[PDB]
Amino acid sequence: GSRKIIHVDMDCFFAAVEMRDNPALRDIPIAIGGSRERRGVISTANYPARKFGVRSAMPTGMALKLCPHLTLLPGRFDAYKEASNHIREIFSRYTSRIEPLSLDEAYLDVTDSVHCHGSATLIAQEIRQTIFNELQLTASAGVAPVKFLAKIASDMNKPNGQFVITPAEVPAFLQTLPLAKIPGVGKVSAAKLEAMGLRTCGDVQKCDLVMLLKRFGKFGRILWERSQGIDERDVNSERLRKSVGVERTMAEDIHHWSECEAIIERLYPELERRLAKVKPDLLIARQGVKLKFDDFQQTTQEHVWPRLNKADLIATARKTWDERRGGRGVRLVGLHVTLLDP
DNA sequence: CTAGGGTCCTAGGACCC
DNA sequence: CTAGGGTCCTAGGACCC
Ligand SMILES: Cc1cn([C@H]2C[C@H](O)[C@@H](COP(=O)(O)OP(=O)(O)OP(=O)(O)O)O2)c(=O)[nH]c1=O
Ligand SMILES: [Mg+2]
Ligand SMILES: [Mg+2]
Numbered sequence: 001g002s003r004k005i006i007h008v009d010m011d012c013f014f015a016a017v018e019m020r021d022n023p024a025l026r027d028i029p030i031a032i033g034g035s036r037e038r039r040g041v042i043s044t045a046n047y048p049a050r051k052f053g054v055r056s057a058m059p060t061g062m063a064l065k066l067c068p069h070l071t072l073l074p075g076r077f078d079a080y081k082e083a084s085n086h087i088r089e090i091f092s093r094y095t096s097r098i099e100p101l102s103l104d105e106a107y108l109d110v111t112d113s114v115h116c117h118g119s120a121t122l123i124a125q126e127i128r129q130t131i132f133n134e135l136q137l138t139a140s141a142g143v144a145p146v147k148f149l150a151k152i153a154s155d156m157n158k159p160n161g162q163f164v165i166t167p168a169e170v171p172a173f174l175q176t177l178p179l180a181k182i183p184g185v186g187k188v189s190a191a192k193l194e195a196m197g198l199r200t201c202g203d204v205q206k207c208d209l210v211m212l213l214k215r216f217g218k219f220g221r222i223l224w225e226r227s228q229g230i231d232e233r234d235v236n237s238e239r240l241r242k243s244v245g246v247e248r249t250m251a252e253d254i255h256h257w258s259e260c261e262a263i264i265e266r267l268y269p270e271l272e273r274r275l276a277k278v279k280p281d282l283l284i285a286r287q288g289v290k291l292k293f294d295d296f297q298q299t300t301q302e303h304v305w306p307r308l309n310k311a312d313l314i315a316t317a318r319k320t321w322d323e324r325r326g327g328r329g330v331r332l333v334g335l336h337v338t339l340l341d342p
Numbered sequence: 343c344t345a346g347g348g349t350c351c352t353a354g355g356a357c358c359c
Numbered sequence: 360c361t362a363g364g365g366t367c368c369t370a371g372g373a374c375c376c
Pocket of ligand 3 (some may be wrong): 009102
């Protein structure tokens with residue numbers, strides 16, 4: 001045999017950084033997100049805000065109606081990136097088998113670690129404590145024989161705790177595990193399963209695999225596997241970004257093409273900078289645009305293209321604007337690139 | 343009264359052999 | 360008295376943080 005997988009996850013990541021750097025924000029409801037005037041949402045919130053119901057992805061106006069004392073911060077990305085680089089270097093003291101999933105979390109494979117006598121429990125404990133020292137931030141961790149259980153486990157003694165699932169404990173832990181707790185099983189999937197009388201991993205273990213393949217395709221095989229603790233996904237330390245985009249939601253819907261082009265002119269230098277970091281010569285596989293309309297419908301138009309090119313993005317966006325807008329107002333415009341393969 | 347990044351999967355149809 | 364099957368494009372969506 002069994003692997004030893006750790007998932008490490010920072011507690012309230014953006015709000016914890018802001019609370020550390022400004023202690024007057026410790027005991028008051030705060031969130032990182034865009035204002036109502038800017039038609040924004042909540043990136044995350046601290047625990048004082050959360051007991052009022054403030055959640056990641058909530059429209060900021062709803063957040064303020066739920067928590068009128070909410071203090072709203074714009075977010076300091078360089079502060080968060082600095083912390084994220086530090087925790088990942090901490091991870092590297094313990095193993096090179098590191099798969100970051102976002103700024104604030106990573107799977108570790110410590111199957112063959114000679115740290116703490118190979119105890120994944122003590123390694124996770126030591127990683128959490130080293131992060132508290134040095135960074136003055138708290139993390140939670142999960143320890144399990146496979147990825148998705150380690151990720152579920154990191155949520156169970158959150159914040160500032162951990163939870164271990166041994167191979168012996170997996171069958172009991174699975175029997176009653178709500179399917180919605182499985183990463184990748186979101187609102188729509190969960191509801192379709194519920195409509196089918198499937199709520200827990202116990203329910204799916206009684207199910208015909210062919211039946212699940214019929215109704216769900218590949219996802220049905222994943223659901224069948226995870227429901228009995230099968231998850232052979234290896235921790236991969238060699239993943240690279242495959243795309244780069246820049247996009248903006250305007251405070252007011254635009255209705256004139258010239259406004260669309262003007263926004264593209266503002267977006268293009270930013271996309272160029274970012275593509276330059278990871279690909280100095282700007283060579284790409286595809287590039288294209290995104291529009292989102294006043295009804296929250298959105299469309300993307302992209303095409304094979306060898307090199308980032310502003311004039312081609314504008315011409316593309318003119319086509320999208322002319323052919324797909326349908327007379328609607330546009331609330332967002334975005335630019336997009338997909339990188340080459342090897 | 344609904345962000346901005348991204349991952350991955352599926353599907354319809356063009357293209358290739 | 361005409362190509363199926365594979366691959367490539369491409370748009371859209373579920374989902375993740
Ligand atoms: C979920 C989510 C997170 N984020 C950002 C803000 C978070 O600080 C960071 C990591 O998100 P999460 O790890 O999902 O949330 P969190 O760490 O803030 O809360 P928890 O302690 O329960 O794990 O990513 C968004 O911008 N939008 C989102 O929808
Ligand atoms: Mg977190
Ligand atoms: Mg996280």
